[PDB]
Amino acid sequence: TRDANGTWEMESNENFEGWMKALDIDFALRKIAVRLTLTLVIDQDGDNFKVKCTSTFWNYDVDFTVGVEFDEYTKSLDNRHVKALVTWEGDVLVCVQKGEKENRGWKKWIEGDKLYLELTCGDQVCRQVFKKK
Ligand SMILES: *C/C=C(C)/C=C/C=C(C)/C=C/C1=C(C)CCCC1(C)C
């Protein structure tokens, strides 16, 4: 449950629009993003991660080392500077992005061939479920 390697295909996506709105993403682009198929590609070696979420139009890419703070510029999302930090809380992978938005980050629970992802921003939570291909 601590191995997130793989290609992960979306099966569930709840409150995607509320989470994007909390990040101030443009209403027009939110309209397009809600239609796109999302694929999550994770390369994990020890504490080193490369995470890629891909669609037709926009990709989101981030590389990090567990336990090492990094400057993140969310250039393909809301275009903000955050201080990001990914850690293990038991078997949960937790990211906190310190910056303008409060309660901003994400959490991953890996349960066999299922991956549960919760994206948070302010009072909004987006809940996604993926299956390993
Ligand atoms: C562990 C996995 C994480 C943190 C994945 C996060 C995914 C995103 C921030 C993706 C956001 C996207 C949008 C802004 C809309 C269009 C395409 C996406 C899925 C890349």
Short mmCIF file of C-alpha atoms and ligand atoms in Angstrom, two decimals:
data_model
loop_
_atom_site.label_atom_id
_atom_site.label_comp_id
_atom_site.label_asym_id
_atom_site.label_seq_id
_atom_site.Cartn_x
_atom_site.Cartn_y
_atom_site.Cartn_z
CA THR A 1 0.00 0.00 0.00
CA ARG A 2 3.06 2.25 -0.19
CA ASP A 3 3.80 1.36 -3.86
CA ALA A 4 2.18 3.89 -6.20
CA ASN A 5 4.09 2.91 -9.35
CA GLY A 6 2.01 2.53 -12.46
CA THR A 7 -0.49 3.88 -14.96
CA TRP A 8 -3.77 4.69 -13.22
CA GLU A 9 -7.06 5.17 -15.03
CA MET A 10 -9.86 7.26 -13.60
CA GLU A 11 -13.05 5.63 -12.39
CA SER A 12 -14.55 8.29 -10.06
CA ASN A 13 -14.23 12.11 -9.79
CA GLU A 14 -16.43 13.92 -7.24
CA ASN A 15 -16.55 17.72 -6.75
CA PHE A 16 -13.92 18.35 -9.45
CA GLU A 17 -15.57 21.63 -10.37
CA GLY A 18 -15.80 22.93 -6.80
CA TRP A 19 -12.13 22.21 -6.17
CA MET A 20 -11.13 23.91 -9.46
CA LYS A 21 -13.34 26.89 -8.57
CA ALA A 22 -11.70 27.14 -5.14
CA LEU A 23 -8.36 27.43 -6.99
CA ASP A 24 -9.86 30.24 -9.15
CA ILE A 25 -9.55 28.36 -12.46
CA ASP A 26 -11.46 30.19 -15.21
CA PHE A 27 -15.09 29.09 -15.62
CA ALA A 28 -14.57 28.43 -19.34
CA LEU A 29 -11.57 26.14 -18.81
CA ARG A 30 -13.26 24.36 -15.92
CA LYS A 31 -15.97 23.55 -18.51
CA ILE A 32 -13.43 21.85 -20.75
CA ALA A 33 -11.49 20.16 -17.94
CA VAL A 34 -14.62 18.42 -16.59
CA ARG A 35 -14.96 16.60 -19.94
CA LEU A 36 -11.37 15.34 -20.24
CA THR A 37 -10.19 11.82 -19.51
CA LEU A 38 -7.39 11.97 -16.92
CA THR A 39 -4.57 9.41 -16.67
CA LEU A 40 -2.18 9.35 -13.72
CA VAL A 41 1.36 8.04 -14.34
CA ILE A 42 3.59 7.54 -11.27
CA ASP A 43 7.29 6.56 -11.18
CA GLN A 44 8.42 5.86 -7.59
CA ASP A 45 11.92 4.80 -6.51
CA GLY A 46 12.63 4.96 -2.80
CA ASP A 47 11.72 8.46 -1.72
CA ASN A 48 11.92 9.83 -5.29
CA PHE A 49 8.67 10.38 -7.19
CA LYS A 50 7.76 11.57 -10.66
CA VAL A 51 4.02 12.18 -11.00
CA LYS A 52 2.28 12.96 -14.31
CA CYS A 53 -1.43 13.59 -14.78
CA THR A 54 -2.22 13.80 -18.46
CA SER A 55 -5.19 14.80 -20.61
CA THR A 56 -5.79 15.91 -24.19
CA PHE A 57 -5.09 19.58 -23.46
CA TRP A 58 -3.25 20.09 -20.17
CA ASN A 59 -0.74 18.00 -18.27
CA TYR A 60 0.37 18.38 -14.65
CA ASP A 61 3.88 17.20 -13.79
CA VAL A 62 5.72 17.20 -10.50
CA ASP A 63 8.90 15.58 -9.26
CA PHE A 64 9.77 15.42 -5.59
CA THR A 65 11.61 13.65 -2.80
CA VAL A 66 9.60 12.58 0.23
CA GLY A 67 10.49 14.76 3.21
CA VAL A 68 12.22 17.54 1.23
CA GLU A 69 10.39 20.84 0.78
CA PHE A 70 10.35 22.22 -2.76
CA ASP A 71 9.18 25.36 -4.51
CA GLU A 72 6.30 24.53 -6.83
CA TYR A 73 4.89 26.81 -9.52
CA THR A 74 1.49 25.50 -10.59
CA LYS A 75 2.08 26.83 -14.10
CA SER A 76 -0.50 24.61 -15.80
CA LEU A 77 -3.17 25.04 -13.08
CA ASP A 78 -3.77 28.24 -11.08
CA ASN A 79 -0.24 29.65 -11.67
CA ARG A 80 0.76 30.22 -8.04
CA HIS A 81 3.95 29.77 -6.04
CA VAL A 82 3.68 27.31 -3.15
CA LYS A 83 6.10 25.64 -0.75
CA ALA A 84 5.28 21.95 -1.16
CA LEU A 85 6.14 19.02 1.06
CA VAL A 86 5.21 15.35 0.61
CA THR A 87 5.41 12.96 3.57
CA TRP A 88 4.18 9.55 4.73
CA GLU A 89 1.53 9.53 7.44
CA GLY A 90 1.37 5.81 7.95
CA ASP A 91 0.64 4.40 4.53
CA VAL A 92 -0.99 7.68 3.37
CA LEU A 93 1.06 9.94 1.07
CA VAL A 94 0.36 13.52 2.06
CA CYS A 95 1.20 16.77 0.36
CA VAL A 96 0.83 20.18 1.88
CA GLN A 97 1.25 23.23 -0.36
CA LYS A 98 1.90 26.30 1.80
CA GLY A 99 0.86 29.58 0.20
CA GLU A 100 -2.09 31.87 -0.39
CA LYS A 101 -4.75 29.17 -0.24
CA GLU A 102 -5.44 27.51 3.07
CA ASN A 103 -5.84 23.74 3.44
CA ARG A 104 -4.22 23.25 0.05
CA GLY A 105 -2.70 19.91 -0.88
CA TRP A 106 -3.54 16.32 -1.63
CA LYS A 107 -3.55 12.84 -0.13
CA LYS A 108 -3.12 9.42 -1.76
CA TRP A 109 -4.29 6.08 -0.37
CA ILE A 110 -3.01 3.12 -2.39
CA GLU A 111 -5.09 -0.04 -1.81
CA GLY A 112 -3.80 -2.78 -4.11
CA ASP A 113 -4.79 -1.90 -7.68
CA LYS A 114 -6.95 1.02 -6.48
CA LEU A 115 -5.70 4.54 -5.80
CA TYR A 116 -7.81 7.07 -3.88
CA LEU A 117 -6.82 10.71 -4.35
CA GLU A 118 -8.23 13.66 -2.40
CA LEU A 119 -7.37 17.16 -3.64
CA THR A 120 -8.11 20.00 -1.25
CA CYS A 121 -8.32 23.75 -1.48
CA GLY A 122 -10.01 25.91 1.13
CA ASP A 123 -13.28 24.34 2.13
CA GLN A 124 -13.45 22.17 -1.02
CA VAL A 125 -12.44 18.52 -1.39
CA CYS A 126 -12.24 16.67 -4.72
CA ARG A 127 -12.34 12.87 -4.40
CA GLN A 128 -10.93 10.74 -7.22
CA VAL A 129 -10.55 6.98 -7.62
CA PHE A 130 -8.21 5.28 -10.11
CA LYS A 131 -7.53 1.70 -11.09
CA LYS A 132 -4.09 0.44 -12.07
CA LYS A 133 -3.74 -0.54 -15.73
C1 LIG B 1 -0.92 12.27 -6.68
C2 LIG B 1 -1.58 12.89 -7.80
C3 LIG B 1 -1.83 14.21 -7.98
C4 LIG B 1 -1.40 15.26 -6.99
C5 LIG B 1 -2.49 14.66 -9.19
C6 LIG B 1 -3.00 15.88 -9.42
C7 LIG B 1 -3.61 16.27 -10.67
C8 LIG B 1 -3.82 17.53 -11.13
C9 LIG B 1 -3.42 18.76 -10.36
C10 LIG B 1 -4.41 17.71 -12.44
C11 LIG B 1 -5.21 18.76 -12.84
C12 LIG B 1 -5.81 18.99 -14.14
C13 LIG B 1 -6.52 20.10 -14.39
C14 LIG B 1 -6.07 21.48 -13.99
C15 LIG B 1 -7.60 20.12 -15.40
C16 LIG B 1 -7.21 19.46 -16.71
C17 LIG B 1 -6.14 18.37 -16.61
C18 LIG B 1 -5.54 17.96 -15.24
C19 LIG B 1 -6.15 16.61 -14.85
C20 LIG B 1 -4.03 17.77 -15.45
#
